[model samples]
Target: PLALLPLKGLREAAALLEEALRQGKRIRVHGDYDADGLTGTAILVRGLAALGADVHPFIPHRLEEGYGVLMERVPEHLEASDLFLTVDCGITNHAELRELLENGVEVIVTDHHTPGKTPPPGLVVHPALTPDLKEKPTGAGVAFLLLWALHERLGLPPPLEYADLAAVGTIADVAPLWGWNRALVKEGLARIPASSWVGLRLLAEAVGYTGKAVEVAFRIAPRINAASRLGEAEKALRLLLTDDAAEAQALVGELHRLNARRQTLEEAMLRKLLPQADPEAKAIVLLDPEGHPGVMGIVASRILEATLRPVFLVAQGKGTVRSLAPISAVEALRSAEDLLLRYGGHKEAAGFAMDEALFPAFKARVEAYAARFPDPVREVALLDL
Candidate 1:
């Protein structure tokens, strides 16, 4: 019953991975720095290893590397492996994917982000590939599905062991939890108590997780995300991959410390930006060169809460956008696409970057687009149970 979700390239993607494993081709798993991407990478690395595939994991830093597969790193990837597998990213990376294919490297892209006008030329595992998918999955969910297909092809049991990680990803991503997603999260939460990964159990314990989405969203996801926000993504990844209890404890402590730092950065940014928001402006767009790139999204969310308007914040050239109901963040970014160097994300949240000189132009353009919609900041009646 759980195997009935429709994803367009499931079988073909699994077949490609099987072929690569059979030929003993090297495989590299590149994941995004966020919780969704990190968890997805862990799933692929662990799953492929269990099946005896030579695999390596790479997580790009938020501050140094920006997002997605970088064109400058293509030569390094080609030299290190014959195949490149991406988790949670690579949907919009058409040129980098084309270069890899032209160099005769095999590729499989698993992502949940909105695709650009043209998808990359390779086997892509994504929920959006299927029109009207009733139960949409997160990036980690896509990775789990790919592994399930691989296990089936190899005559192995369902790879339910990684459900805990998938559930955390889904909750952290705020994905709609119904139908397939609900089933996945329920299975993963059930598995958490006896999860094979000791680090996962410890993280749940550290956060006093009681098998609820709120605990994971508020406690667990932020810690995992903090590691990357502070430029220490590998520490979080290593914690997930490590089997030693003592090492897991140390990594958990480090993540807590990083999260504290993240909160401070977010609060400081919010305090500075809130006053700058124009009371008469329908949208809020502010730039702070000193703002931490890693905490921009959370800060933007906080600003949106205070202003009740679409909020876009840029720090050191990187920008993050958060929108309210009836306003799409990705759609707003599309209006200023000509000015942006790169941009991607979902309907509610999106991120971008552009020349600092274009900041004024971007603000004018995006605010004008958002002005088309009526003020979304409406009063709501509340009831106490």
Candidate 2:
């Protein structure tokens, strides 16, 4: 059922959502501060709002606040009997979840990242626990499962209306295009031209999109992500949820300006970081926390591909590592969970963080783990077979 639409936690998540709705509870949907996060928030906000649920979205703004829900941010959305639904994160925030529960908040986690030491407390909809669907789902995919089931339970229409948005979330996060993920990408592509969402239509039209995966991957997704990467995720969320064409156009146009700035920064950073690799090392760990922690995932991915080894690209205490298994032994990084303050992602792609003070120890532990996984290299050979 990894390829199936209704993955784990769909029904129970929906039931919880329904209860929150019935009780006039304020449902706060929070997640990672990226495309997956914003887009997941978009889906839940739209999907939940369709059923007339009083739901709102909250995304962290600073790199310091990037990984978990802040205790300080709670006062604004404070409410008793509120349901805290985490979209792309919360597998690593047991302490925070405990705090929320102490405050009478009901927490449900829907994510695709590998679970850390925090045992599943209360309601958690994740692929790692779902035997048949353990093939690393995107956060958007997990959120989709919840929304699809919510729609079913409440007699609301399917998320097909926002399928285009979900598809971008799945693809932009670089999840594999197989299983149910494939269906999401395909259906999302088909729905693009006929999409009912003004933002999607505007984003596509602004970029000359023509239902191609690469179009979503290269052009649109980056634009959707640009604002988030620069620490304004609300921009992307608003674009996804907007009904005003002019406003959507303005956001897309603004993203155009930001994405180019990102490209320039990324190119400069890549040029400086590429040659700093050790071809013989099993892993490359660099201390350039100034490399704009938001885009370090892209840098980390580049390092891994260039060296065929696990690359740890850390910036401002945040690090993004890619590969052991679902990404092979890269999954083995989970063993060093003791070093990370907060972290989550699939086997293929994961984001973890430690305080700047602990990063030195975290790097050491990461490299030792990578030794067991080792860098996988491709050998050039004559393919006469």
Candidate 3:
């Protein structure tokens, strides 16, 4: 009963699925903890369930566990699961990919992260890797393409039912509002008025979205992201996938409370650290073990906007640390990975960690990198739309 789809690699992926289904293999859907990742995982899980696939969802803890196919946890999560499908991450995890391959686990990477040197081996489905696809360079965009491909191959009518999830993930991820992404989001926005997903509906109302434009996703996205930042990613995932309106409302209320706390922590940390920043530096790097992990990325983004300087905000954890950096500093700090034990993120947004003892060396290296570039003027460029 499956319909044929026009995706470049859908047939191949479908064939693999067919074989897996015949052999009764377990499929693990691994995703990140952020809004985009959560929504994508939900979509894949729901869709696969509709097709009668034995699929389960697994997401890493944003603060406790680093991003994308963490090698240490993969064995436990992947045990007995014949296929590992990564959503929203795994583009640059060569070592993790190698371990999976060496262990004889097949990986289907569906992500939007920028590809690193030495692409992961196996079936990779990303817009950046395959430029010919209609997908934009966003995780939701890529996931939607996969959805459409699967729908077509299965002879299933397009499930606009899933568009609400797509819109939230796409907008929250800040994917460009153009191309297939634009079209999909535009269509998805219209469906929000009658979304079957109770959690989304309540989240929309909690953020004061009265069937208007999706400015709410930006506001609500942070609330969901706050859970991950505060070392509670499962809460965000639960909030999104819940079916009960009362439960959804309660979760949104808790998220609002957490977000307020996040804002307070972010402001206090920024105020305390900004005074200590070197004026001669072209970038801003603030270290705070007391910083709230949920809001570091938001704070870094705000700092970059205000200072026109790429910013990095670090939050020290018990034995480890977590940090966020604006994408504008990616090229400037490309070599910074050497100073970090692990790092991964986008052009304007990234997260990393290292030995607490190496904090001083890491700061010095970042300062040196910032100094190499022409000092950025601390000015705001306001645009009137």
Model 3 lDDT tens row, 221-336: 77877777777777777777777888888888888887777778878877876676554565666677776666666666556556556677767732122222322445544676
**lDDT, residue 86, candidate 2:** 86
Model 2 RMSD to the real structure?
Answer: 5.5
lDDT of 1 by residue, 185-217 (tens): 888887887588878888889989888878888
lDDT of 3 at 385: 8
* Model 3 worst lDDT window (10 residues): 318-327
TM-score of each: 0.84, 0.77, 0.81
Which pairs of residues have clashing backbones in candidate 3?
A: 2-154, 2-155, 3-153, 3-154, 3-155, 229-294, 326-348, 327-347, 327-348, 327-349
Best by lDDT: 1
lDDT digits (tens) for residues 1-385 of candidate 2: 2233646677788888898888888888887777877788888888888788888888888445656566676655455338888888877767655545557777888887768876556688888877665356688878877888877876866677767877888998888776677878888888988588888888898889988989988999889778877877778788888879889889888889889988887887788788887757666777775778767777777776666666767777677776532123245457667877777766666677677777667667776666664235443121311
Cα RMSD (angstroms) for every candidate in the order listed = 4.1, 5.5, 4.6
**Steric clash count of candidate 3:** 10
* Candidate 1 to native Cα RMSD, angstroms: 4.1
